[PDB]
Design an enzyme around this catalytic site. Structure first.
Site, mmCIF file in Angstrom:
data_model
loop_
_atom_site.group_PDB
_atom_site.id
_atom_site.type_symbol
_atom_site.label_atom_id
_atom_site.label_comp_id
_atom_site.label_asym_id
_atom_site.label_seq_id
_atom_site.Cartn_x
_atom_site.Cartn_y
_atom_site.Cartn_z
ATOM 1 N N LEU A 265 0.790 -1.229 0.000
ATOM 2 C CA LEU A 265 0.000 0.000 0.000
ATOM 3 C C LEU A 265 0.826 1.285 0.000
ATOM 4 O O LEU A 265 0.367 2.331 -0.472
ATOM 5 C CB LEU A 265 -0.936 0.013 1.206
ATOM 6 C CG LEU A 265 -1.999 -1.076 1.268
ATOM 7 C CD1 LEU A 265 -2.811 -0.905 2.533
ATOM 8 C CD2 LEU A 265 -2.891 -1.011 0.044
ATOM 9 N N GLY A 266 2.031 1.207 0.550
ATOM 10 C CA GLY A 266 2.883 2.374 0.659
ATOM 11 C C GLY A 266 4.346 2.005 0.742
ATOM 12 O O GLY A 266 4.696 0.913 1.197
ATOM 13 N N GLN A 267 5.200 2.918 0.290
ATOM 14 C CA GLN A 267 6.643 2.736 0.370
ATOM 15 C C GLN A 267 7.236 3.786 1.296
ATOM 16 O O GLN A 267 7.219 4.979 0.985
ATOM 17 C CB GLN A 267 7.278 2.848 -1.018
ATOM 18 C CG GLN A 267 8.803 2.770 -1.025
ATOM 19 C CD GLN A 267 9.326 1.346 -0.958
ATOM 20 O OE1 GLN A 267 8.552 0.384 -0.962
ATOM 21 N NE2 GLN A 267 10.649 1.205 -0.900
ATOM 22 N N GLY A 268 7.755 3.341 2.435
ATOM 23 C CA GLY A 268 8.342 4.241 3.408
ATOM 24 C C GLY A 268 9.840 4.050 3.532
ATOM 25 O O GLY A 268 10.441 3.280 2.781
ATOM 26 N N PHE B 131 11.217 3.193 6.585
ATOM 27 C CA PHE B 131 11.420 2.196 7.632
ATOM 28 C C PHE B 131 10.540 0.957 7.473
ATOM 29 O O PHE B 131 10.666 0.005 8.239
ATOM 30 C CB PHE B 131 11.205 2.821 9.012
ATOM 31 C CG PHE B 131 11.954 4.106 9.214
ATOM 32 C CD1 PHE B 131 13.311 4.100 9.488
ATOM 33 C CD2 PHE B 131 11.298 5.322 9.121
ATOM 34 C CE1 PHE B 131 14.001 5.283 9.669
ATOM 35 C CE2 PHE B 131 11.981 6.509 9.300
ATOM 36 C CZ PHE B 131 13.333 6.491 9.575
ATOM 37 N N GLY B 132 9.654 0.969 6.481
ATOM 38 C CA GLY B 132 8.815 -0.184 6.219
ATOM 39 C C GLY B 132 7.796 0.042 5.122
ATOM 40 O O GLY B 132 7.821 1.062 4.437
ATOM 41 N N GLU B 133 6.891 -0.919 4.963
ATOM 42 C CA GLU B 133 5.844 -0.850 3.950
ATOM 43 C C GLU B 133 4.478 -1.047 4.594
ATOM 44 O O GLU B 133 4.365 -1.688 5.638
ATOM 45 C CB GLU B 133 6.062 -1.927 2.886
ATOM 46 C CG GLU B 133 7.488 -2.008 2.355
ATOM 47 C CD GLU B 133 7.715 -3.227 1.469
ATOM 48 O OE1 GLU B 133 7.046 -4.259 1.696
ATOM 49 O OE2 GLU B 133 8.564 -3.156 0.550
ATOM 50 N N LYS C 98 1.180 -2.335 8.887
ATOM 51 C CA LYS C 98 2.370 -1.511 8.780
ATOM 52 C C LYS C 98 3.580 -2.351 9.161
ATOM 53 O O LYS C 98 3.769 -2.688 10.329
ATOM 54 C CB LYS C 98 2.255 -0.307 9.715
ATOM 55 C CG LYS C 98 3.287 0.775 9.481
ATOM 56 C CD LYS C 98 2.982 2.017 10.313
ATOM 57 C CE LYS C 98 4.057 3.096 10.133
ATOM 58 N NZ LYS C 98 3.673 4.418 10.729
ATOM 59 N N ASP D 119 0.702 15.401 13.608
ATOM 60 C CA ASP D 119 0.711 15.296 12.166
ATOM 61 C C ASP D 119 -0.719 15.110 11.683
ATOM 62 O O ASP D 119 -0.986 14.408 10.713
ATOM 63 C CB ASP D 119 1.608 14.138 11.747
ATOM 64 C CG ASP D 119 2.297 14.387 10.420
ATOM 65 O OD1 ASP D 119 2.281 15.549 9.945
ATOM 66 O OD2 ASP D 119 2.853 13.411 9.861
HETATM 67 C C1 LIG Z 1 3.933 12.011 19.989
HETATM 68 C C2 LIG Z 1 3.342 12.092 18.584
HETATM 69 N N1 LIG Z 1 2.053 11.320 18.474
HETATM 70 C C3 LIG Z 1 1.726 10.494 19.654
HETATM 71 C C4 LIG Z 1 0.296 9.892 19.546
HETATM 72 N N2 LIG Z 1 -0.320 9.710 18.196
HETATM 73 C C5 LIG Z 1 -1.510 8.785 18.042
HETATM 74 C C6 LIG Z 1 -1.340 7.685 16.968
HETATM 75 C C7 LIG Z 1 -0.095 7.149 16.663
HETATM 76 C C8 LIG Z 1 0.154 6.184 15.674
HETATM 77 C C9 LIG Z 1 -0.835 5.635 14.859
HETATM 78 N N3 LIG Z 1 -0.615 4.632 13.805
HETATM 79 C C10 LIG Z 1 -1.508 4.298 12.693
HETATM 80 O O1 LIG Z 1 -2.567 4.912 12.645
HETATM 81 C C11 LIG Z 1 -1.378 3.188 11.544
HETATM 82 C C12 LIG Z 1 -0.286 2.337 11.444
HETATM 83 C C13 LIG Z 1 -0.250 1.377 10.424
HETATM 84 C C14 LIG Z 1 -1.261 1.206 9.467
HETATM 85 C C15 LIG Z 1 -2.399 2.018 9.498
HETATM 86 C C16 LIG Z 1 -3.534 1.844 8.426
HETATM 87 C C17 LIG Z 1 -4.884 1.656 8.795
HETATM 88 C C18 LIG Z 1 -5.924 1.530 7.847
HETATM 89 C C19 LIG Z 1 -5.661 1.594 6.468
HETATM 90 N N4 LIG Z 1 -6.611 1.485 5.377
HETATM 91 C C20 LIG Z 1 -6.030 1.587 4.189
HETATM 92 N N5 LIG Z 1 -6.568 1.501 2.873
HETATM 93 C C21 LIG Z 1 -6.082 2.081 1.641
HETATM 94 O O2 LIG Z 1 -4.948 2.529 1.686
HETATM 95 C C22 LIG Z 1 -6.695 1.777 0.260
HETATM 96 C C23 LIG Z 1 -7.428 2.820 -0.590
HETATM 97 C C24 LIG Z 1 -6.030 2.455 -0.966
HETATM 98 S S1 LIG Z 1 -4.175 1.857 4.385
HETATM 99 C C25 LIG Z 1 -4.277 1.792 6.180
HETATM 100 N N6 LIG Z 1 -3.258 1.922 7.063
HETATM 101 C C26 LIG Z 1 -2.389 2.989 10.552
HETATM 102 C C27 LIG Z 1 -2.120 6.166 15.158
HETATM 103 C C28 LIG Z 1 -2.358 7.132 16.160
HETATM 104 C C29 LIG Z 1 -3.791 7.670 16.340
HETATM 105 F F1 LIG Z 1 -4.782 7.032 15.688
HETATM 106 F F2 LIG Z 1 -3.919 8.932 15.867
HETATM 107 F F3 LIG Z 1 -4.226 7.711 17.613
HETATM 108 C C30 LIG Z 1 0.579 9.911 17.029
HETATM 109 C C31 LIG Z 1 1.983 10.524 17.233
#
Ligand SMILES: CCN1CCN(Cc2ccc(NC(=O)c3cccc(-c4ccc5nc(NC(=O)C6CC6)sc5n4)c3)cc2C(F)(F)F)CC1
Length: 258
Positions: A17-20, A22-24, A39, A130
């Site tokens: 789904l994505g190219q980063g 540190f990972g995909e 992720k 972000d």
């Molecule tokens: C100190 C800075 N702070 C602290 C707290 N703070 C909250 C926070 C932190 C991290 C995350 N981490 C993710 O969210 C995440 C990780 C991996 C994968 C996904 C993920 C989920 C569904 C999905 N559906 C998709 N479909 C499509 O692409 C199709 C059409 C093409 S691709 C996909 N990828 C989501 C979520 C949240 C938070 F939610 F904000 F609380 C963020 C950073």
């Protein structure tokens, strides 16, 4: 190693789904039943602690309008698994095809849901840092959820003195309001980061986006108050949006674009 930990077997990594760096990001099947986003972390690109800090963060944060962490593979390869969102980023979705048919009401609903996820984040005294349309995932039924994977979206005190707080998230949210109502367009069109930093500090704020309601632009403007503490809560925002079309823009009529 906790009760979020799972076997890679329950995970079918179907589509990338994505190219980063540190990972995909993969879209896979969990327990062969439930569709999940995944992720990955390329081991040897970023310590597990670092990469799984976001995961540890996601654990303490279960909310209808946040991307729900579902499970985790800490032991390399390090997979994080989450509810999957069919429509991808809110950004790809605004700029994209279904974007063209998104009007204020659906946009404000999304705003509302995000505002909500972000309000949850607020209750948790968490910060996102972000918050921006590129981090909102759309699901079926215009479900949008705050996710995470940029000074245009970043509140000054955050961009400048790294005073990243929920309030600077409110700021971003303001920016997200413009994304939402510009159909994903880049904040501060034609301006580049330094022109923005210079500008936003001199007090520049984006004008009312084409066909966006001043009241929505005011909301944005609140979100961008120089003084962070003056910026509204996401409880205010959420509620303001949830109720928008009644309390705020009852006379709203659909437009060409909004
Ligand atoms: C100190 C800075 N702070 C602290 C707290 N703070 C909250 C926070 C932190 C991290 C995350 N981490 C993710 O969210 C995440 C990780 C991996 C994968 C996904 C993920 C989920 C569904 C999905 N559906 C998709 N479909 C499509 O692409 C199709 C059409 C093409 S691709 C996909 N990828 C989501 C979520 C949240 C938070 F939610 F904000 F609380 C963020 C950073």
């Amino acid at each position: 190693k906790d009760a979020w930990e799972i076997p890679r077997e329950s995970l079918r990594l179907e589509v990338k789904l994505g190219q980063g760096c540190f990972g995909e990001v993969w879209m896979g099947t969990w327990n062969g039943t439930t569709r999940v986003a995944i992720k990955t972390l390329k081991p040897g690109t970023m310590s597990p602690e670092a990469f799984l800090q976001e995961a540890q963060v996601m654990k303490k944060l279960r909310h209808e309008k946040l991307v729900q962490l579902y499970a985790v593979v800490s032991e390399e390869p390090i997979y994080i698994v989450t509810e999957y969102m069919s429509k991808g980023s809110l950004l790809d979705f605004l700029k994209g095809e279904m974007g063209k048919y998104l009007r204020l009401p659906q946009l404000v609903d999304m705003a509302a849901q995000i505002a909500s996820g972000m309000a949850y984040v607020e209750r948790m005294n968490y910060v996102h840092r972000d918050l921006r349309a590129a981090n909102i995932l759309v699901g079926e039924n215009l479900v949008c959820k705050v996710a995470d994977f940029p000074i245009k979206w970043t509140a000054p005190e955050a961009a400048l003195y790294g005073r990243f707080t929920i309030k600077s998230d409110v700021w971003s949210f303001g920016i997200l309001l413009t994304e939402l109502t510009t159909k994903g367009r880049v904040p501060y069109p034609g301006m580049v980061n330094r022109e923005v930093l210079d500008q936003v500090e001199r007090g520049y704020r984006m004008p009312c986006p084409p066909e966006c309601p001043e009241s929505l632009h005011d909301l944005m403007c609140q979100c961008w108050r120089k003084d962070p503490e003056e910026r509204p809560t996401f409880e205010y925002l959420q509620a303001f949006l949830e109720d928008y079309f009644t309390s705020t823009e009852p006379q709203y009529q659909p437009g060409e674009n909004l």
